Amino acid sequence: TIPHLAIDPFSLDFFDDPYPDQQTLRDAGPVVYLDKWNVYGVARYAEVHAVLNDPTTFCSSRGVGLSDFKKEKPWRPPSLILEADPPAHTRPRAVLSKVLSPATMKTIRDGFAAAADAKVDELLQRGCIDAIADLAEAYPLSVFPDAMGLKQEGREHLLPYAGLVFNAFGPPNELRQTAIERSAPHQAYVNEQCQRPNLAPGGFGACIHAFTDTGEITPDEAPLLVRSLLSAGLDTTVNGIGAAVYCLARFPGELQRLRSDPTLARNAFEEAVRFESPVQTFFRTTTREVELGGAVIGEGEKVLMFLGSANRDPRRWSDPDLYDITRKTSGHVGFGSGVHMCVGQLVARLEGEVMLSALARKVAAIDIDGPVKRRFNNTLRGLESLPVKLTPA
Ligand code: HEM
Ligand SMILES: O=C(O)c1ccc2cc[nH]c2c1
Ligand SMILES: O=C(O)c1ccc2cc[nH]c2c1
Ligand SMILES: O=C(O)c1ccc2cc[nH]c2c1
Ligand SMILES: [Cl-]
């Protein structure tokens, strides 16, 4: 018997306060059935980790949102990387892994760190700033579109295009419907920027298109791979940085430990990813009967993984509701796990580290001062507005 729960993890009330319900999702049993969306769910670390690490049984090619692409029309042409299984997955994965490699990171690191220090110096001139518009959004907007080689015009579409992508993995609720109704101008902007003549030399976009020259990908595949980094590579980093600042603001003792040792920046960012989990959920579809958490699930069944919940499961983590910058974070699933584990994670940690290093060296206190506003999305967790006073060191 699988416990049935009436919890809607894509409701606004859930997003506004997910932690009691994520507890119930873990504590009802290792596998649950959600009445609202007629789907099975796993919320504990053990099951989440196990499902991510068996892609043959728990496939991604039938979609990693609620929609089963074997039965339903995808809202757009599927991603060649996220919505593919090995072996088809492997060549696109290899392309993007090379494009966002450690060696690539070394070549852009100094520019990113200089941008982050300039950003923080400038916020300190105003003092009262919005840690989302002025920092978690503005910083990645200042580095990532340029690292891609995007033109200046139309960049206002990038944040809402990714809200659309992340809303679309959800169930058919109002967030998802309104996003698709409003999608056409964002998709048109992204489609044009995926084309080879629109991507500046030296940037990730042109680097992807250079794989056509050796035959490693076709000219039809290359724009779809650029489209993956424009879908996945901005709003996630915005929300991880936003999380990290919100954590440092709510946990003033941790900000003082980071000031005491700025080399903790990279880990303080990793721990914000665990603690907030910007990507809260993904689905897989079984490709055979499987025993999961003691229950036998049939072939062809969607399974929802609660990544945020797994990252707070007291089965795996000591004091999971505490933000601890020296936590051993290795093994969190905020970037996934296994063959699809975030191929952009070094870009994310690069941005997060240099920004928290700049904060570590320049700022003495971060105090929330003004109303905090959450942004609701089917898959992304983050704030719309976080008004803070920054006190210079
Ligand atoms: C804090 C920031 C980020 C978080 C939390 C995040 C989270 C994730 C997660 C959970 C997955 C696994 C998907 C699955 O298992 O189905 C993933 C994969 C991926 N991420 Fe990220 N990511 C972040 C930043 C980035 C960036 C900066 C980029 C690109 C520049 C990126 C590009 C991708 C792509 C293309 C995949 C698909 C990899 C695959 O299917 O093999 N992400 N990400
Ligand atoms: O043009 C489209 O909307 C569309 C939607 C779904 C798919 C699946 C492969 N091609 C598509 C195009
Ligand atoms: O601040 C924005 O422009 C904005 C608009 C829509 C979304 C959807 C996810 N993040 C957003 C930011
Ligand atoms: O390949 C993509 O288009 C894509 C879209 C969203 C996500 C979120 C994690 N990885 C992604 C890849
Ligand atoms: Cl699209």
CATH number at residue 86: 1.10.630.10
Approach to solving:
X-ray
Residue 327 belongs to domain spanning: 1-393
**Rounded distance between C-alpha atoms, residue 332 and residue 315, angstroms:** 13
Atom number of ligand 2 nearest to Cα 74: 6
Distance 384 CA to ligand 3 centre (A): 8
List residues bridging with 365 in a β-sheet.
391
Which tokens is 199 given?
């991507």
**Rounded distance between C-alpha atoms, residue 393 and residue 379, angstroms:** 36
Query: Is 383 within 8 Å of 374 (Cβ atoms)?
Result: yes
Q: How far is CA 41 from CA 104, 105, 275, 306, in A?
A: 38, 36, 20, 7
Kindly state the DSSP code that residue 3 receives in the 8-state scheme.
-
| Resolution of the structure, angstroms | 1.8
CA torsion sign, 236 to 166 to 161 to 339? Answer: positive
Query: Is 286 within 8 Å of 57 (Cβ atoms)?
Result: yes
**Rounded distance between C-alpha atoms, residue 224 and residue 227, angstroms:** 5
b/e per residue, 336-362, with b = 16+ CB within 10 A?
bbebbebbbbebbbbbbbbbbbbbbeb
**Rounded distance between C-alpha atoms, residue 271 and residue 275, angstroms:** 6
Tell me which H or E stretch contains 375.
strand 373-375
224 C-beta closer than 6 A to ligand 4: no
163 C-beta closer than 6 A to ligand 1: no
Q: Is 93 annotated as a binding residue?
A: yes
Neighbours of 217 (CB within 10 A): 21
| Nearest to 60, CA basis, from 40, 43, 77, 80 | 80
HSE, CB side, 13 Å, CA atoms: give it for residue 210. Answer: 11
Which tokens is 278 given?
């910007």
Q: Is 316 annotated as a binding residue?
A: no
Distance 53 CA to ligand 2 centre (A): 29
Query: Is 325 within 8 Å of 274 (Cβ atoms)?
Result: no
Q: How far is CA 264 from CA 87, 236, 326, 328, in A?
A: 38, 21, 7, 12
Grouping H, G, I as helix, E, B as strand and the rest as coil, residue 352 is: helix
| Nearest to 244, CA basis, from 383, 373, 129 | 383
HSE, CB side, 13 Å, CA atoms: give it for residue 60. Answer: 27
- Give CA angle at 48 (42, 49), nearest 5°: 165
Domain count, the chain: 1
Distance 279 CA to ligand 4 centre (A): 10
- Give residues with Cβ within 8 angstroms of 184, minimum separation 6: none
